[PDB]
Design an enzyme around this catalytic site. Structure first.
Site, short mmCIF file in Angstrom:
data_model
loop_
_atom_site.label_atom_id
_atom_site.label_comp_id
_atom_site.label_asym_id
_atom_site.label_seq_id
_atom_site.Cartn_x
_atom_site.Cartn_y
_atom_site.Cartn_z
N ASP A 7 0.89 -1.16 0.00
CA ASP A 7 0.00 0.00 0.00
C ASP A 7 0.94 1.22 0.00
O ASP A 7 1.64 1.43 1.00
CB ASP A 7 -0.97 0.00 1.17
N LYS A 68 3.09 11.47 -3.40
CA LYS A 68 1.97 10.85 -4.16
C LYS A 68 1.03 11.91 -4.72
O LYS A 68 0.32 11.61 -5.68
CB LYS A 68 1.19 9.91 -3.26
N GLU A 172 -7.25 0.95 -4.81
CA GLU A 172 -7.42 0.85 -3.33
C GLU A 172 -8.79 0.28 -3.00
O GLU A 172 -8.87 -0.58 -2.11
CB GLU A 172 -7.01 2.21 -2.70
N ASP A 194 -12.84 5.83 2.65
CA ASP A 194 -11.42 5.70 3.00
C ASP A 194 -10.93 7.03 3.56
O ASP A 194 -10.60 7.95 2.77
CB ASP A 194 -10.56 5.24 1.82
#
Ligand SMILES: N#Cc1ccc(COC[C@H]2O[C@@H](n3c(NCc4ccc(Cl)c(Cl)c4)nc4c(N)ncnc43)[C@H](O)[C@@H]2O)cc1
Length: 377
Positions: A7, A68, A172, A194
């Site tokens: 992840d 990211k 994800e 999330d």
């Protein structure tokens, strides 16, 4: 050879292996199953993870994180312009793409986002190699469902630099669905909510006889647990000033000590109603000693909690879904442990109970490791 599951989050990474029919989420060298996605370039040394994050207070221009947010984007993208105004390390325009500029022994050094992400991936690779006692050349790596081909390719390129062939990119929401083991038979519509440390994503995932499709995605790129901590920080900094005539913002070390205790206090308040925030000599000769209640934690953050429903409404609207059309709610990210978050989600869905894991911070890496296991057979 082995295939590991990683992840690669905004604020952290997490690595799992599939061994003897079980997923093992692995501890870093400090004993933590989550590693902060920080890399520091201070005084001729390069650190990765918690040790790099500790450099941010005194070396904010040399301490790289949240890469990211940049990876596979263009320098002039609206989102990247906003991130350059928020991030303290220098971001430069290299042929239309954001690159990171730091000093190593005083020398200007420029990295592509994927070079920094590679350093994170190398650290995850090394954890896996030490645990498996053998070399690792292959991984499943997670991306956000909204990632375009350039963002996915830049992530694969991070893998290649780290000496990892990324044999499969999975989104994800699919990783979460694998982790929670959602039945693959027949048709199921899942809301994957999330809420992490820095970002909020919600997706409608449809599972149809083993085939996973994300029908819609929405989120808030600057809404996570770190924001809830900052609301608490803001309040206690105002209070300490009113009581003591000390503005803690004038001492960066004081702010660092307070943030560490506020983060712990927030976590306590997912279980208890009242907690103590205590720092001896937060500045010389002045102790910090406060109580925070769950009610005041909620009051300080109510608007941010309710903001998470805006993207939920957007994905239902995008998919032309009725709330009733959702079959299960799955929570990912440590911030979904906040009782008020679960209450608001439950009540938006006209009483329906959300499913939540017990280690919501690891669910995505767990699903990546399951996907690794599926690929090897
Ligand atoms: N950089 C960095 C970094 C450090 C820790 C984490 C993990 O958490 C993601 C978010 O989840 C939040 N969170 C968490 N995350 C759990 C966690 C915190 C620290 C570590 Cl090392 C690990 Cl094993 C797991 N638990 C919470 C709780 N009980 N109540 C409310 N919020 C909680 C946490 O505060 C953070 O905002 C993510 C990134």
């Amino acid at each position: 050879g082995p295939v590991i599951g990683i992840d690669l989050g905004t604020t952290y990474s997490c690595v799992g292996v599939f061994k003897n029919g079980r997923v093992e989420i692995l501890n870093n060298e400090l004993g933590n199953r989550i590693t902060p996605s920080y890399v520091s370039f201070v005084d001729g040394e390069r650190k990765v993870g918690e040790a790099a994050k500790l450099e941010a207070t005194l070396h904010p221009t040399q301490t790289v994180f949240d890469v990211k947010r940049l990876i596979g984007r263009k320098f002039d993208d609206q989102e990247v312009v906003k991130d350059r105004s928020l991030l303290p390390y220098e971001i430069v325009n290299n042929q239309g793409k954001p690159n990171i500029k730091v000093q190593i022994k005083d020398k200007d050094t420029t990295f592509a986002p994927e070079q920094i992400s590679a350093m994170v991936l190398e650290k995850m690779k090394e954890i896996a190699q030490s645990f498996l006692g053998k070399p690792v050349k292959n991984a499943v790596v997670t991306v956000p469902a909204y990632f375009n081909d350039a963002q996915r390719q830049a992530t694969k390129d991070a893998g290649t630099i780290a000496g990892l062939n990324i044999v499969r990119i999975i989104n994800e929401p699919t990783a979460a669905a694998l982790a929670y083991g959602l039945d693959k038979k027949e048709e199921t519509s899942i809301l994957v909510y999330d809420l992490g440390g820095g970002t909020f994503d919600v997706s409608i995932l449809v599972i149809d006889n083993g085939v996973f499709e994300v029908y819609a995605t929405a989120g808030n790129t600057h809404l996570g647990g770190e924001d809830f901590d900052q609301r608490v920080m803001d309040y206690f900094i105002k209070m300490f000033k009113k009581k003591n005539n000390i503005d803690l913002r004038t001492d960066k070390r004081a702010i660092q000590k307070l943030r560490k205790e506020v983060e712990i206090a927030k976590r306590n308040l997912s279980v208890v109603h009242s907690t103590q925030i205590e720092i001896e000599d937060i500045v010389e000769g002045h102790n910090f000693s406060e109580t925070l209640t769950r009610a005041k934690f909620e009051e300080l953050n109510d608007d941010l909690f309710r903001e998470t429903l805006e993207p939920v409404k957007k994905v239902l609207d995008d998919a032309k879904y009725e709330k009733s059309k959702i079959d299960e709610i799955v929570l990912v990210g440590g911030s979904t442990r906040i009782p008020k978050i679960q209450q608001i989600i439950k009540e938006f869905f006209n009483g329906k109970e959300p499913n939540r894991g017990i280690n919501p911070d690891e669910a995505v890496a767990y699903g990546a490791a399951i996907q690794a296991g599926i690929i090897l057979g």
